[PDB]
Copies of this chain bind each other. A is one copy, B any other.
């Protein structure tokens, strides 16, 4: 078929909503179309030419962008789990052959590129196109019919879930809990006030932390209310610096900010590094900074992507939260765009949290 798609020339950049030749494989398990597609900094970086690791699939001269997808099943081979008209979230990362990839933890690929591949990013077409072919195993079923568009948030939230898995694994190094066995009063601070930070914060809340998002500027009454609704605090760190931190999560990617907060981490504290900012400036880490980490048995863990199981978990949390605080969750999606509006990739709609593309 000829079909519509939003494409880049990876890694060169640019973006055009335009038509393309894309033939059916004789061999397919499932055929789908896109309902919603979220966009994040990674897409904007792709478009902007800022990411040297991205590439078009083999023997092609464009890449269909889009990896934060909510899709609907048009057609599907015989199976016990999905049927026509079922909504699904498609896996971003797909496995290679490495000891991790082969048990479905391509999120911890031991090789990196080119063992694993990511839809819309590294050698595999994304989801901003009229038709999509895939294998059933790569699709996670949306089981709550009430969520609708909220399900598009699955992809950003699964990364949060894997990060908390990493938290759970490394915090086993000691007794992290209070001596009553609980997390009551343990302090989570999240660097940043964006999409990922919100999702960190809500999960933090469900695990029983006291949570505080932080930024180098005040926030909008909109965001403030959303946080208030979840029982999440906020602080401008130029005005009030949190200390005595048990769980530090960075979404900024900024070193100066990371290390100033690390020097507030308690004994047996855990630092999750999540944010990318290759442009971020150097911050000098000195011997006293190293000593601070050592003497406190602090763990700094970098986390990227997630496994299928974490997509399932993300859907379950999106449901729980939608049924308890619908206005807040709905407010996460702050603009819906038509596929023509390709200027979303260079410019942020006003007061953005999560921008998405409604397809028809």
Q: Which residues of A contact B (CB under 8 A)?
A: 53, 80-81, 98-100, 102-105, 107-112, 137, 144, 165-166, 169-170, 172-175, 177-185, 206, 208, 253-255, 258-259, 266-268, 273-291, 293-304, 307-310, 312, 316, 319-320, 323-324
Chain B residues with CB under 8 Å of A169's CB are 169-170, 172-173
Contact A273 B288 (CB under 8 A): no
Known: A99-B103, A277-B290, A323-B323. Contact between A268 and B110, CB under 8 A? yes
Contact B294 A254 (CB under 8 A): no
Contact A174 B100 (CB under 8 A): yes
Chain B residues with CB under 8 Å of A299's CB are 170, 299-302
Measured between C-beta atoms, what is the minimum distance from A283 to chain B in Å?
Answer: 6
Known: A105-B181, A206-B316, A323-B323. Contact between A175 and B285, CB under 8 A? no
Contact A181 B308 (CB under 8 A): yes
Measured between C-beta atoms, what is the minimum distance from A39 to chain B in Å?
Answer: 20
Chain B residues with CB under 8 Å of A105's CB are 174-175, 181
Chain B residues with CB under 8 Å of A98's CB are 179
Copies per complex?
4
Measured between C-beta atoms, what is the minimum distance from A3 to chain B in Å?
Answer: 29
Known: A178-B99, A294-B303, A319-B324. Contact between A255 and B104, CB under 8 A? no
A319 to B287, CA, bound (A): 35
Contact B291 A175 (CB under 8 A): no
Contact B303 A175 (CB under 8 A): no
Contact A104 B170 (CB under 8 A): no
Chain B residues with CB under 8 Å of A303's CB are 294, 297
Contact B290 A258 (CB under 8 A): yes
A100 to B175, CA, bound (A): 6
Chain B residues with CB under 8 Å of A308's CB are 180-182
Measured between C-beta atoms, what is the minimum distance from A323 to chain B in Å?
Answer: 4
A267 to B113, CA, bound (A): 11
Contact B100 A309 (CB under 8 A): no
Chain B residues with CB under 8 Å of A111's CB are 267
Contact B255 A286 (CB under 8 A): yes
Contact A179 B285 (CB under 8 A): no
Chain B residues with CB under 8 Å of A110's CB are 174-175, 266-268
Contact A286 B293 (CB under 8 A): no
A138 to B313, CA, bound (A): 31
